[model samples]
Target: ALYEDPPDQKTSPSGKPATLKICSWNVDGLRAWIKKKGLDWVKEEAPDILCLQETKCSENKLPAELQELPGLSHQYWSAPSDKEGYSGVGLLSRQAPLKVSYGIGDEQEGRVIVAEFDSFVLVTAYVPNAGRGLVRLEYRQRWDEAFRKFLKGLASRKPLVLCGDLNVAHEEIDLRNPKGNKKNAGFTPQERQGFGELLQAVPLADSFRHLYPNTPYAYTFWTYMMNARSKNVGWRLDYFLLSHSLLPALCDSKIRSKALGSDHCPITLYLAL
Candidate 1:
C-alpha cells in the first residue's frame, strides 16, 4: 500500500529484501534544512541513492555538516553559478555513479541532475513553477515538452527512475481542494494537461499512482498557512516516475509525509534491481 518489482523480486534466495532504495526530496533550502535536522532520517534509513531538488545552493555553499554524512558522500551538484541561493538539484549516493550529467541544456539553471548507475538512470529535477498569476505557464509548458524529450532520449538507452517536485498535481485526486484550485498555478488545466501529455509521451509510470491508484491523503508538499499539513489539506506535487520498462523492478513508492524542515517532504522508491 505504501510502495515496485519484477520476476525475481523476493530476494537473493534469502528472506531479506535485496532492495535499492532511492529517495527524492525537495529540501527547499540546503542550509536551513540541515539546521532543522532534516537529515536525521538519512542516517536511519540510509537509502542507496538520495536524489534532491531545490537544494537552493551551490556545492561550495553546502553546510559543513552535510559533507560528512555517512552514506551520502558521493555528491553530484548542479547549482546556478550566477544565483548564490537559487535553484539547485543534486544526487547524493552511497555508491559512486558511472557518470553524472547536469541539466537538459542550460545546466546553469540547476534544475536537473542525471546520474547513471549500473541498473538504471536516476533523474532528479525541480520543475519550474507556473507563477502566482500563471504568468510563467507558457514557459513551463515549453520546458515540459523539452523534459519529455530528454527522458525519452535517456530511456532509449536505459530505463530511468525519475523523481522530483514536478510542480503539477496532475489529477483532481492529487490535491485536497482540486475544484477551487483549478485556476491556480500548479493545478491549472494547462499544467495538468502538460503533465498528462508528459506521462503519455515519455511512456512512463507514476510510481505512487501506479502502486496505489485509490490511495488518498498522501501528500508531499503543503502550504504554511491555513494549517494545510495539519489538516491534511495538501498537494501531491512531488513524485517518483519510472520508465514503463522499469516498472517491474519497482518495489514501492512512498511519501515520507511525516518528515519535516521544508514545505515539501521526501518521497521514496524501492526497486529489486
Candidate 2:
C-alpha cells in the first residue's frame, strides 16, 4: 500500500547516477535559528536539498551568515506578501533547480515553494494549521483540497517529493496523547481525514510510515512546554511524501530527533536516482 512501480533512472550533473539526501524542518524562525548555530548541524548533515517551513522571515531579513552557508548556495524563499514576519517556506539546494515557483495559485500566504530538478519536482509546504478550537478547520480543508490538486498536477509531469511540516497526525500511532488530543487542532478527525485524502488523491506514499510501518515513539515535533522533548511526548507532524512511481528510488527515510534548534526536529529522505 505504500510503494508501487519503479521509476526510470536519471543521470546526475556529473553524468552518472546519483543519490539525493533531502532534509526538512520547521525552524520556527530563520533569524533565530541562525543565531542558535543551527547551520552547524545542517553542515554536518550535508543534505543535498534542505526544505524549511515556518521560516517567519523574508529573504531580505535573513542574516548574511546564513546567506554564505557553504553547501546551500542556491536558495529560494516564499514569504507572506501582506505580512512582514509570519508563515513562510524556503528551499536550499546544493545544485540549482531548473525552475522555482511560489504558492499553488493566488492564495499565497508564503506556505509553499516548488523547485524543479532534473529528476523530480520538490515541494516544501507549511500547511495552514487549524487554529485554536478548530476555528480555521474549514479553511484548512479548502487549502488541503487545493494543495492536493496542485501536487497531482506536478506528479503528472514527473515523480515528485513533497516535504515539510504538514501539521497533522494522520493516525493515532503518530502522536503520544492521541486519546487526550482527539479533538485538538492536529488530531481532529477532519484534519486527519483531509491528510488521508491528500495521499489518496495525489496517490503519494508516506515514506516514513511506509518504510517503518510498525515503528512507535518516532516523532518529529514536541511542544516546548511540559518538558515534552525530554518526555518524548510528541507528534509526527513533519513528513516526506513521494509519488508512488518513485518507490524504487527511496533508500531511507529518517526522523532526526537528536538534531536540535527547533520545537520540530528534521526529517530526511534518501533517494537513489
Candidate 3:
C-alpha cells in the first residue's frame, strides 16, 4: 500500500505538508516478539513509519510474528552479512517511497535501511557496538564517520529523519549510571566521542530531547538480562534525529515507556510534514 502523494495534500509547516508519524525500536528479535507483544503495540499505536533495529534474524528467517500484522504494507530488511541471527534493521511503512537503500556501502551487513519519501528521507540503522573491552572501538569509529557522510549526502537532497539503536549514550544525562559505566561498552569515552562527532557532522538534533529538554530520567532502552527497567536503570540509546531543515515541522517526540513489546521501548515523533 504505497501511498502516492495526493494532489490536494495539505502542506505542513515545513512546506512538505505530509503528516508523518515515525517510531523506532530495537525489537531484540522480531520472530520472538512479533507474536508476543509487537503486534499488539502496532495495532494500538499505528505509526506511519516503523524503524526497527536488532531484528537478529536473517531474511530467510522471516518471523511469523510479522506475518500476523497485516497492517504493514511494505517492508524492507537488512541483516548482517558476516553473522547469522545478529545485527539487522528494517523499515515498515504505509506509504510508498521514491527509493530505498540497504546498507551504507561495502559494510553492507543488513544493518542499514533508508526509505526516501517525497518530502523527507527516513533511515533506520543498527549501529555496530564497540563491545566489552572496546574490541571493536576503532572499527565502530570508522563506521561512525562513514555513516555520517552517508547521512549528509542524503541531507543534501532532503530533510532526513534517522533513528535506531545508536549504541552510545551520547551524554551523561542520557544514562542512569553514566559515571559508573564510563568504561563500559556503550558509555566509553571513545564511543561517546564518536557519537558526538557524528552529531557535529550531521548537524542533527535529537527530536525527543529537543522538545522535552527538562524532562528528567528520559530513557529509551532497558536490558532484559536484568530487571533494568524495574529499577529505571536505563539509557536513552535509541534516538529520532532530524535534519536542521525539518526542525520546524517537528511537533512532538516521546519514548513509549508503556508500550511493553520488547526490552527496548519505542521512540516516536510527530512531524507536521
Candidate 4:
C-alpha cells in the first residue's frame, strides 16, 4: 500500500516533526573558508540547506571533500568561466533539488543559481556591486532590472526563498555609517531604489527586517579594515528574502555573527516546512 506524509511535515533528529532550516553566506572564498574552519560551524548549525555567494572558485578548484561536504551531499555551483577567482554562487543541500539552473540567460558571471525543491524555489545570488567611484553603477542597474524580472517569473510558479549578498543596503538603518557612505556602491541612491523596486515587484519580504523592524546595528557584513567586526560596525548586505506567501511557515530568522569565517556572516531562515 502507498503512504503519504502531511504538508510542511519533516522528521527531526529525535525523529519528531520539526521545522526546516536554511542558511546563506557569502564565504568570500571557498578554499579559505574551509581552511579557516568554516565547515565547523556548518556542522554545528546543521542546516538542511545552505546557499553560498561569492564562492570565488570554480568546481575544479574546490577540494574533493568540500565538493561533497558531509550532511550536504547535493551540490550545485555557478562559476565564472571568463574570469577565474571571481564572482560565483553555490548551493549545498541535504536533499536533492528537483531542478537547477545557472544564471538568468546569456549572462554567465556565475552570480546566480536557482534550485527548485518540493516546497519552494531557492535562489542564491551575488549581485554586482556598483564598484568604487560608481564605475559600474549603470551596469549594476541593468543587472538589477533583469534579476528582478527573473525572480518574479520564478515566483509565479512557487514561493521563493532568495538569499545572498545582494550588495545593497536598502535603508539607512541597514548600515552603521550610512550617512558617511551615502555615495558608496552599496548605499547609493540608485542602488537602494533598485532594491526597493525589486521587493515591490516580487512582493518579497526581508525575513530579518520583517522579524526585527527596529533592531539597529544588526549587520551581516563587516569590512576587514579598522577592526569593523570587533566594533560591530557593519552593513546588512546579505539577506534572506521570502515570498509573502511563505510568511505563514516562517519560524525564525537570524544573523549568525558568531559563526565566523568570512567578512559576511551567515543568515538563517527557519520554516515549518
Which number leads on lDDT?
4
Query: lDDT of candidate 4 vs native?
Result: 0.86
Which consecutive 10 residues in model 1 have the weakest lDDT in total? 1-10
The TM-score values for the models, in the order shown, are 0.92, 0.92, 0.90, 0.92
Per-residue lDDT tens digits for candidate 1, residues 1-273, read 121112223332234465798888888998888888878876765788888888888777777787778688898888888877887988889899998888896436889988889878888989999999889999998999999998888888888888999999988888878889988889998889989887888778898899778777677888888877788788899999888887667767778877888999887777877
Span of 10 residues, lowest total lDDT, candidate 4: 1-10
Candidate 4 residue lDDT tens string, 1-273: 111111322342234444688989999998899888988788888999999888899888877766557689998888999999998898999999999999997556999999999989999999999999999999999999999998899999989999999999989889889899989899999999999999999979997788678777888889989998888888999988989998777767788878779999988877876
Q: Write down the lDDT of every candidate, Cα atoms only.
A: 0.82, 0.85, 0.80, 0.86
In terms of lDDT, which candidate is stronger, 2 or 3?
2
- What is the Cα-based lDDT of residue 56 in candidate 3? 85
Rank ordering of all candidates by lDDT, starting from the highest: 4, 2, 1, 3
Residue-wise C-alpha lDDT for candidate 3, range 1-273, written one tens digit per residue: 111111222344556654777888889888776867687887787888888898888889786567665657788888777888887888888877889998887644778898989888888888888887888888888888899898888888888888999998888878788789988778988888877777778779887778667565778888886788887788888998888888888767777777776888887777886
Tens-place lDDT digits, model 2, residues 1-273: 111213332443235553888999999888887687788889988889999999899878877876777688998889897888788998999999998999997564999999999998999999999988889988998998999888888888989899999999989889888899878889898889989999899888998888778877788899989989888899999999999888777777888888789899988787877
Which residue segments of model 2 deviate by more than 4 Å?
A: 1-18
Worst ten in a row by lDDT for model 2: 1-10
For the record, the alpha-carbon RMSD of candidate 2 to the native fold, in angstroms, is: 5.3
TM-score, candidate 2, is 0.92
Give the Å error, residue 143, model 4.
0.6
Better of 3 and 4 by lDDT: 4
